[PDB]
Design a protein around this ligand. Structure first.
Ligand SMILES: *[C@@H]1O[C@H](CO)[C@@H](O)[C@H](O)[C@H]1NC(C)=O
Lengths: 40, 49
């Protein structure tokens, strides 16, 4: 969904289409994201 | 002689109740017809029309 404001979530409506569909079958109770990105 | 030669044996062992079914045999298909009352079956969606 392209937008016009880099600030907080905008006002509008847009539905999400299905993308991937998998028969994993597995047991889930916790999820984590991945980030690709010294301290001074 | 027979009974002494080497033999290639393969075991087709399968299990259940481990994951949703994802291995199924080939499913045949027939030709498509139009303008005639027929019994159709689209991906298991059975019906007459
Ligand atoms: C996790 O899903 C599994 C099957 O893979 C099920 O046996 C189990 O009840 C779930 N885990 C817990 C702690 O209940």
């Amino acid at each position: 969904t392209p937008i016009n404001l880099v600030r907080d979530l905008p006002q509008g409506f847009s539905a999400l289409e299905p993308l991937v569909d998998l028969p994993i079958g597995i047991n889930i109770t916790r999820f984590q994201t991945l980030l690709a990105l010294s301290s001074s | 002689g027979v009974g002494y030669q080497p033999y290639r044996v393969v075991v087709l062992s399968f299990e259940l109740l481990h994951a949703p079914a994802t291995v199924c045999g080939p499913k045949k298909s027939t030709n498509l017809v139009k303008n005639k009352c027929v019994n159709f079956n689209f991906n298991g969606l059975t019906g007459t029309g």
